[PDB]
Amino acid sequence: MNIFEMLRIDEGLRLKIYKDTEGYYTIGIGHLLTKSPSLNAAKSELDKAIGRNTNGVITKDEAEKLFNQDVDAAVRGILRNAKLKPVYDSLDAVRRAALINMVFQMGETGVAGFTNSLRMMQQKRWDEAAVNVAKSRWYNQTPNRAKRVITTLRTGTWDAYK
């Protein structure tokens, strides 16, 4: 198991513009296109992203390219983040994976906001951090997913992903 497979599981794959859990226009593997309520605006963004006149549909390959780019941006975001970098450096490999997931899902800023959880993560207090991170909108909106990420964070293994 690795970050790519893990996220592929959490996000799915769709070749057509669709709406995410929050109603945002998205495509491929969890690639947010826009928070605007306009399908057109989303088609616009999509074309710009792909470099061609898509008409709201992409290929598997195109989806994978977006995904590679997104995973890459997530890691770099982490490493460039003053709050995040130090947590990340202190973690083992499975756990780092869990941090990248959260960041891919909610944005660097978003995650950088979990001040208290981050401290616990850094202090290696697994159970506390798991509990704390659950008291969040993130968990309440997408509980099953959140649960897989939290278990990964807590245990340091891939069990949740069986």
Q: How far apart are CA 113 and CA 116, in angstroms?
A: 9
> Which is closer to Cl ion, CB of 145 or CB of 154?
145
Among 145, 148, 150, 160, binds Cl ion (CB under 5 A): 145
Cα torsion 132, 135, 137, 140: sign? positive
Binding of Cl ion at residue 40 (CB under 5 A)? no
Q: How far is the CB of 7 from Cl ion (least distance, A)?
A: 14
Is residue 20 part of the annotated active site? The answer reads yes
Out of 61, 93, 144, 162, point to the residue binding Cl ion (CB under 5 A): 144
Cα–Cα nearest to 43, from 60, 58, 23, 62: 58
Catalytic residue, candidates 5, 10, 20, 45: 20
Edge-to-edge strands of the sheet including 14-19?
A: 14-19, 25-28, 31-34
Contact code string over 99-138 relative to Cl ion, x by CB under 5 A: ----------------------------------------
Is 7 exposed, middle or buried, given 0-12, 13-18 or 19+ CB atoms closer than 10 A?
buried
Name the active-site residue from 10, 11, 70, 108: 11
Q: Which of 81, 142, 151, 155 binds Cl ion (CB under 5 A)?
A: 142
4 is in an annotated binding site: no
Using an 8 Å Cβ cutoff, are 117 and 128 in contact? Answer: no
Of 38-46, 109-117, 126-134, 145-153: span binding Cl ion (CB under 5 A): 145-153
* Phi and psi at residue 55, to the nearest 5°: 75, 35
The answer on whether 117 is annotated among ligand-binding residues is yes
73: part of which helix (H) or strand (E)?
helix 60-80
Where on the chain is the footprint of Cl ion (CB under 5 A)?
142, 144-145
Binding residues: 32, 104, 117, 132
Please identify every residue annotated as catalytic: 11, 20
